[PDB]
């Protein structure tokens, strides 16, 4: 997260860390959507151009975390994965269309002050809240700046970062890039005329873009950090998987399994 701030304790209790067992490393963010299911970006698990194709046994999910690097004994919970489900129409070759995956945990996790699921949007919540100018919130432990040989100093955060960003009109998103965008994506970030900063960045993928509904006081996951070009660049916007557009698939998987 670029030009964000440290999260408060318990601020995003649905935030999950996807953690590689060997070598040890942060792979991606993810989100907790029930006691046994975690949502993430497909490309965190399968992306052939970078020789990435992980199986269930390569990964752990760490839930309830604040520090990026500490083992937060008696605060975090570490869970193993039973099965990974990638959207069958995920397009890694061209534009990361339908960049979504579900993971089923081997055992249910117990909720706590630090561990609690986010809601998925219904049609009315999506129509009410997914409008240009309205702000949502993105969280992650990804890079603090776009990777560049000229950078000086710390590139990774000590604790979970948070930034709030406005949704951008579709035509503005479309004109900002030469990558083909689809109805399964939306973009967010400040426009040049607003003169403000803030973005997701590498290492934040899979994490949630959330909005709070004033109609029922609940937080909803509207997006998944997917892709961008650089981080925090002038005239660019970050791109997010449109969770409501793909909700039928999510519901099919959860109900089936």
């Amino acid at each position: 997260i670029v030009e964000g701030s440290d999260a408060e304790i318990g601020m995003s209790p649905w935030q999950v860390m996807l953690f590689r067992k060997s070598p040890q490393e942060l792979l991606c963010g993810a989100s907790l959507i029930s006691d046994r299911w975690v949502l993430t970006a497909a490309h965190c698990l399968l992306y052939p151009p970078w020789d990435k194709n992980f199986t269930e046994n390569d990964l752990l999910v760490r839930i309830g975390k604040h520090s990026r690097t500490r083992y937060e004994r008696n605060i975090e919970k570490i869970s193993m994965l039973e099965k990974i489900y990638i959207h069958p129409r995920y397009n890694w070759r061209e534009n990361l269309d339908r960049d979504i995956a579900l993971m089923k945990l081997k055992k249910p996790v117990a909720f706590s002050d630090y561990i609690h699921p986010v809601c998925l949007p219904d049609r009315e919540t999506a129509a009410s809240l997914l409008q240009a100018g309205y702000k949502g919130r993105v969280t992650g432990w990804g890079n603090l700046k776009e990777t560049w040989t000229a950078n000086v100093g710390k590139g990774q955060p000590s604790v979970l970062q948070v930034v709030n960003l406005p949704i951008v009109e579709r035509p503005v998103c479309k004109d900002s890039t030469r990558i083909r965008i689809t109805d399964n994506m939306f973009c967010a970030g400040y426009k040049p005329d607003e003169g403000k900063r803030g973005d997701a960045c590498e290492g934040d993928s899979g994490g949630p873009f959330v909005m709070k509904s004033p109609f029922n006081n609940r937080w909803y996951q509207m997006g998944i950090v997917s892709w961008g070009e650089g981080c925090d660049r002038d005239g660019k916007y970050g791109f997010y998987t449109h969770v409501f557009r793909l909700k039928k698939w999510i519901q099919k998987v959860i109900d089936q399994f």
Partner: peptide, 10 residues
């Protein structure tokens, strides 16, 4: 970089 987690996990 990362603190070791318990080997039961793995």
């Amino acid at each position: 970089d990362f603190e070791e987690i318990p080997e039961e996990y793995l």
